[PDB]
């Protein structure tokens, strides 16, 4: 008895959420809204939480409906700049029984990787990020690797640390990665692979590495279920799955 | 200007602490007590924190001296059962300017590995620990791997989770590791290696792995310096380096 | 202009071979035989090599047809005990223009892993095999890990080596893996994973590890194309993809 | 009863060879020549193989002596350009009982890594090299990583392969490594680490990785003992430890 609706129920990601919800013991799928269905269906079937993987063009309207009918929302749809977040916050004002989670990344293991990398960064002199993807990826490095590096660098700055140890004299071009706020980032492009990351931290005598591996590109359901299960404790707007992790 | 003394200054680990202290910018080595030197030296030279890597036979006396002369202490020496911890706590009663840290493990990367493994364990169905050591190691699995497994299992229990997914019918003896509170633990014994650990967590579509690697057996100084630097914020007795990590 | 037929063209594996053949520049798909089609189609369309992923019940008949019409064959279908191999060898007697490759494993990376593990084993004192699979796998350890261990052990015996270094006193049950001809084998069962193997070899100061990773269970086409491309240099029966690798 | 002399017996590497020889069962240390000892000692004590880790200034004289007294030689000393190799070959002419091995790298695991990388390269579309070292290393990438990349690229060219798959549009500077004959090479500089390499190969559905790890910088003895043990089967000059591996 969490009654759950899914917007974008027939999309690439939405299907996996319908499946996940059907497998669970505690969640009941009361509505599957695709592009042509009225949202009033969520009201009728008494949805309490909704999960949204739709489009940037649809999501603000739908979200406004949900919030205005008292339904909490777990939103994976992208496109949320500051102005849009300010819009969601404005709608939520004075509504203590409604929560919204906007998570630009729902891959629970990518998220824990960023969280743990930030916590570790205080304690090690050296930090590098290696990212590996299928060779059709256009952008290098990946957005996740850029974010991870920026998080480490902000952690290091907050702890007042030095920039890092390195005796390299005239490294060849490219050998030392892309420098992102002082953190080397290396991007590997490899047939057979999907999406992977390694953060390697180093200090006297030892290292710590945090590795993230996706064996396929449609594994958002564990993160989304963390959202659905916990949103009743997070009234108002929360941005980022990390804030639901209880860390 | 943290004036620091080292007890066991000539021992295997103590030397590395003397070195580390000498390299630093903020810590001044005012005393190096070996087995035949009076501890009053710490009083004379105005030691404020002491670091102890001595023996279980020496440490209680020395610690009692330090605490009774108002010197805080960072203790790596082993042998601290409950009764001994109760003794240290009794001595510290009503002494708001004295801190003691007793850390059964000062390898900052082993410690962060246990901490992060506990935090991650809520979120993944599968969890296994692989530990790898030089082949002269007597005990298998390692104490660190046992502790890590017990921490994961306590985390899982606290989150009310199931025991883990596995369709294995009549696994061969030994193939699935040693079960430690329900967590498989595999011990590899390998020439060339030192001490290494991997915690692998798994859920739909993805994994997270935390790897610890020691490239040699005398890398306790980063953890100990975390102790020395922070003990002024931890009056009383703290047991475990994790509690100094600000997590 | 290698004209290629595929038997089992509509099966799980056969489809991937049809696809691969269609993508190539040098191979022309002249026939796709499923269960209800006459094999004479291969003769009509002038097939020169055939690829077989069918069933153990079909394969001997089909293969006999191919060989008797002078068509060479790359066979992935399983079920080939000694008596069946002796049957294939008997049919091939005195037929210098016909080749058959029977490969119990067509995953080019699993095969190179076994080959390289055998070659390395002479030179290292320590050798262990770690295998990791999705947690629905029934058998532990995997057949590939068993074969890999047996290959290492045969290599070691051939080089007259000792059994391996290890100071372990009363290891806990299961901690040291399943012993397979003296090689420890550890099986990890992990949500998110597919099929992976690591062979770790160790000696003074160093290790060598060979890792195999499958990101999905339908990646036999690279190996099969090695077969199709090279079978014209391997008249007669060859068993095992390794013998086509030019090593 | 292989009587063995060591030139440079008191040097960093020579000591480890003296140790190794003393531990063995089959080799007898009959001479330890340092800088001030006559080489005639090798003749007196009936040395049959000599191991040389000295200096580029000493080695040609010493080697000429050894060869002219019929003693075979396993030479790790560096400095051997073509002209010097031509000199060694000239001295060895018509001397069927004398062998010399000049090995620019004696780390058995680095060598097997290059050998296996060359053999694998025919079969995979994607190939990258990641190298990791202590952060005092001056040069990036490492010489071993450069050599490994050049070997892969020569293998690929010999097999007539394409250059590699990659959809990357305007990668950031440095993100894709240093291109070495078309093979990406990434150099990581990390406190705690020693010297490590990974060659990652990729094709549809799968990868193969070969990892080399040194846990300390003085692990040449296994390779050198391969030399000493086998040199009696390699009369004349051989350059490179790989040629002694029986591959
Ligand atoms: N971690 C993350 O946060 C994460 C991960 C993956 C994807 N995403 C984002 O999630 C969104 C969906 O991605 P996807 O890969 O699932 O795309 P998709 O397969 O295109 O699915 C979008 C679905 O929403 C439906 N839709 C459009 N307007 C709608 C409306 N008003 N009400 C209900 N359904 C509507 C679509 O139907 P029509 O075809 O008729 O429009 C389609 O089934 C994208 O913005 C993507 O960027 C986020
Ligand atoms: N992570 C950890 O918390 C961690 C890590 C490593 C080691 N340890 C522990 O730390 C302790 C030391 O280990 P180690 O490897 O450094 O051993 P060690 O090399 O034997 O050093 C012990 C040193 O303490 C000296 N000593 C003995 N009694 C003393 C006294 N009353 N005052 C001052 N010095 C005294 C010894 O001198 P003498 O030879 O005259 O006795 C020796 O130099 C051990 O208990 C070990 O178990 C803990
Ligand atoms: N590395 C390896 O060597 C490797 C890897 C994977 C699989 N295999 C083996 O390859 C075989 C096929 O596996 P799979 O997963 O592709 O199984 P599958 O999906 O069942 O495919 C078998 C196909 O063969 C067809 N078939 C049956 N009899 C036939 C005939 N006389 N002529 C032509 N087609 C016929 C089947 O049609 P019907 O449904 O009408 O029978 C079906 O399309 C199995 O033996 C499996 O063990 C080997
Ligand atoms: N894989 C490889 O092939 C590999 C690996 C490591 C090192 N190396 C090379 O091996 C060589 C030695 O390196 P290392 O680190 O051992 O250097 P090292 O510690 O300087 O040792 C050189 C030794 O040779 C002695 N020596 C000099 N001239 C001699 C002579 N005529 N006869 C006998 N001994 C003599 C030196 O004594 P003095 O101090 O009096 O000169 C010293 O003990 C270097 O060229 C290094 O580049 C190669």
Blueprint (SSEs and pairs):
The structure is a homotetramer of 247-residue chains.
Chain A (H helix, E strand, L loop, with lengths): L1 E6 L4 H12 L3 E7 L6 H5 L4 E4 L3 H13 L3 E4 L6 H11 L6 E4 L5 H13 L5 E8 L9 H16 L19 E3 L2 E7 L5 E9 L2 E9 L6 H10 L5 E4 L8
The site of one NADP nicotinamide-adenine-dinucleotide phosphate has 23 residues of chain B, from helix 1 and helix 3.
Give an account of the 3D structure.
The structure is a homotetramer of 247-residue chains. Chain A is α/β, with parallel strands linked by helices and 247 residues long. The relative contact order of chain A is 0.17. Chain A has two domains: 1-106 and 216-247, 3-Layer(aba) Sandwich (Rossmann fold); 107-215, Dihydrodipicolinate Reductase, domain 2. The first copy, chain A, has helices spanning 12-23, 40-44, 56-68, 82-92, 108-120, 143-158, 221-230, and strands at residues 2-7, 27-33, 49-52, 72-75, 99-102, 126-133, 178-180, 183-189, 195-203, 206-214, 236-239. The longest helix of chain A has 16 residues, at 143-158. The radius of gyration of chain A is 20 Å and the shape is elongated. The two termini of chain A are 26 Å apart. A six-stranded parallel β-sheet of chain A has the order 2-1-3-4-5-11, sandwiched between helices. Chains in contact: A-B, A-C, A-D, B-C, B-D, C-D. The interface between A and D is large, with 45 and 45 residues. Strand 10 (206-214) of chain C pairs antiparallel with strand 10 (206-214) of chain D. One NADP nicotinamide-adenine-dinucleotide phosphate (NAP) is lined by residues 7-8, 10-14, 33-35, 53-55, 58, 62, 76-78, 103-106, 220 of chain D. Chains A, B, C, D: Its main location: cytoplasm.
């Amino acid at each position: 008895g969490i009654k759950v609706g899914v917007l974008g129920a027939k999309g690439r990601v939405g299907q996996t959420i319908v499946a996940a919800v059907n497998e669970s013991d505690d969640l009941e799928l009361v509505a599957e809204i695709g592009v042509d269905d009225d949202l009033s269906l969520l009201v009728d079937n008494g949805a309490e939480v909704v999960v949204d993987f739709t489009t940037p063009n649809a999501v603000m309207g739908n979200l406004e409906f949900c919030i205005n009918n008292g339904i909490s929302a777990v939103v994976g749809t992208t496109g949320f700049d500051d102005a849009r977040l300010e819009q969601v916050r404005d709608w939520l004002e004075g509504k203590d029984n409604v929560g919204v989670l906007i998570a630009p990344n729902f891959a629970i293991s990518a998220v824990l990787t960023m969280v743990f990398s930030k916590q570790a960064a205080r304690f090690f002199e050296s930090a590098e990020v290696i990212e590996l993807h299928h060779p059709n990826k256009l952008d290098a490095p990946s957005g996740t690797a850029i974010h991870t590096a920026q998080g480490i660098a902000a952690a290091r700055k907050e702890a007042g640390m030095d920039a890092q140890p390195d005796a390299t004299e005239q490294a060849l071009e490219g050998s030392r990665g892309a420098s992102v706020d002082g953190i080397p980032v290396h991007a590997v492009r490899m047939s057979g692979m999907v999406a992977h990351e390694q953060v390697i931290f180093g200090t006297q005598g030892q290292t710590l590495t945090i590795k993230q591996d996706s064996y396929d590109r449609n594994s958002f359901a564990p993160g989304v279920l963390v959202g659905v299960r916990n949103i009743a404790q997070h009234p108002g707007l929360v941005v980022g799955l990390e804030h639901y992790l209880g860390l």
